Ligand binder design. Sequence first.
Ligand SMILES: O=C(O)Cc1ccccc1
Ligand SMILES: [Ca+2]
Lengths: 557, 206
Amino acid sequence: SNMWVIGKSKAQDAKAIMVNGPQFGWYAPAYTYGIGLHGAGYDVTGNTPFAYPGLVFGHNGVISWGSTAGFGDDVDIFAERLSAEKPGYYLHNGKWVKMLSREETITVKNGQAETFTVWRTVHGNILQTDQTTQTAYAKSRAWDGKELASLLAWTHQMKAKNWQEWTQQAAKQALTINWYYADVNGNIGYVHTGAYPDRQSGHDPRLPVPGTGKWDWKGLLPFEMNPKVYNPQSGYIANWANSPQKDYPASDLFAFLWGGADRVTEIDRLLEQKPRLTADQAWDVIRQTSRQDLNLRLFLPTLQAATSGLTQSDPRRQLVETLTRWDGINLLNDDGKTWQQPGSAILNVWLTSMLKRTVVAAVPMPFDKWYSASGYETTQDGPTGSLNISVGAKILYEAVQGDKSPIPQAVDLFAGKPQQEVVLAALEDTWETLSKRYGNNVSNWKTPAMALTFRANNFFGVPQAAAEETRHQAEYQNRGTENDMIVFSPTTSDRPVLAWDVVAPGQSGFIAPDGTVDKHYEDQLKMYENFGRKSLWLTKQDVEAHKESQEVLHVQR
Amino acid sequence: SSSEIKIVRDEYGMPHIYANDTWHLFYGYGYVVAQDRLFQMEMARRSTQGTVAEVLGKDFVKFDKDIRRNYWPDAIRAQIAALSPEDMSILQGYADGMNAWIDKVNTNPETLLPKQFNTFGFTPKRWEPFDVAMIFVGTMANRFSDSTSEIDNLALLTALKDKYGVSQGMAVFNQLKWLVNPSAPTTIAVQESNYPLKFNQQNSQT
Ligand SMILES: O=C(O)Cc1ccccc1
Ligand SMILES: [Ca+2]
């Protein structure tokens, strides 16, 4: 997910601009739900996943808010000590403590019901078992017991009218989530919210710890520790699942790294390119980043150095020149299925080969597989989520950065060989592979573009619509499942704020019994495709002037 | 009117709810959700509670089991029971609002029942605050804030130490899965501040 918030110092024809692109994957009906609430202390408009009581994306006429996943490390695994002589128990602080347990029955359509037991310790629910050593692992979440508080914090934050009131609520949101703030006065802010454990000295958060007591968390860190910033000197706040703050540790996921190579740089570059941005320019950043190859910037220097000495007739040389002339912005050909430039395909094949030759080679099987992906891998239906720089590529990046990398290279990923040799060897692989498939005339190479699918199964892999309701878009776009922009104090409007969003396919997922689709079943689908957007209304006057229907209910609790 | 809830949909069908108190406001919210996304929300409920196999069969038994093994219902219910009347009104109103429309749906399914229900062979049942809470818990907490691979991490580290030896293996682990990388681009500039806390990168817990 990405987000950029432009403050008074960088906003043109406005005091603040918030553009949010949460990336949840794409689904039909829409992942998020448009909703406006007016009363009981609320006056809000926007849209939110699964129609949560609290709007994750919206504003209340005074401040606006947004989110992207935090990816902090708020989960540790405790290795519980079991005894075959004491089933259902585990050793904790010198005593054998009884596990919590519960019976569950899975009822099955056209099948036999299954009953099983779920087990839990003071550290959390049990993953499985390993009774050879008599061990079972429990998953400890720093937010355990704060689920409802997080839901509520996301709701009450909608009533905040300043930074202080808003952070009061951010402090109660316990999941690892980046929260963003902007207001009518041009103030902008950011908080990496969430409960994080205060771990015992020497506790490596990347590896399990004994559950016998000595390694239990001391508690949770105070809100003071949560990375946060209000009105940064830079004049903007940009995030694309990158690190919140210098020295801040990332999730322990082996496939997730915050390093020198990070896609957020693509956003920073565009925001810093111009002293000030208008609302339309801020919005255009969606289009640009969604089409931006994320590896070109990272490896082109390496590619150029390796081929700087090769003769013009060397094909490896011409592949690099092709990349050097390219801005990395993919565009579909008129066939609506291939990309105008072959750059991504070149980088894909090259990077795949590089990783195989370097990181993959230095890592023992089967772990080596963790580092083999180029990040371009996809199916006919296209990426199920955002595109990112692969974990293997981020490691390779540190390696090709040489001494400019702060990461000690305990093992030389190029294993003694000159990096140029390996780079050139991968370019040879790339020319062979690609020229074999597309011929020797690069200028007529029409490589397959990635497509995009609004899936009928929700992210769980569970049907939330009939298969036929799946929708397809020719151009894959590395952008938010929805995009919303709030512009505070726009100089060309009579309103203190303007806002837009796009909820595709549409607001309604309703299909009547006779198959008749709702009028708002698909009326934002084309809008999504062409980077369009529609106005979000807040004031009673704006809502009234744009009323399509009305219904009054009279009910008593 | 204190019992009055006004629903105005704009030109894209987006609902705006007008109500005087908390319960009525979220009742309106739940009502329009039941109108717009009943099947999606029903299947989201089953997804977050591991009751999919109930309507889709054996292919989802493993899924349902994995869902139930990943949370503790009674704990969620306890949190709900501890809510103040005001906060409870959010969840209760929301559920009551959904039920209001769901009842209408089941009173006249020949006109109001979303086609998918017919297709998938079942009908929608009423919601409780627990259900509303679990939509959030199961789709935001349990899936976007519940990530760890420590067991695999340790396996990698162990393999590295076997290949390269103890010290070098630990060093390669810090090369492939560093705790922090000072060159990582940050949302907050270094001039603003830095994170105070530093961790051990040697697995001293062994
Ligand atoms: O970034 C993500 O993976 C998805 C997400 C966006 C905003 C809030 C929570 C999760
Ligand atoms: Ca951890």
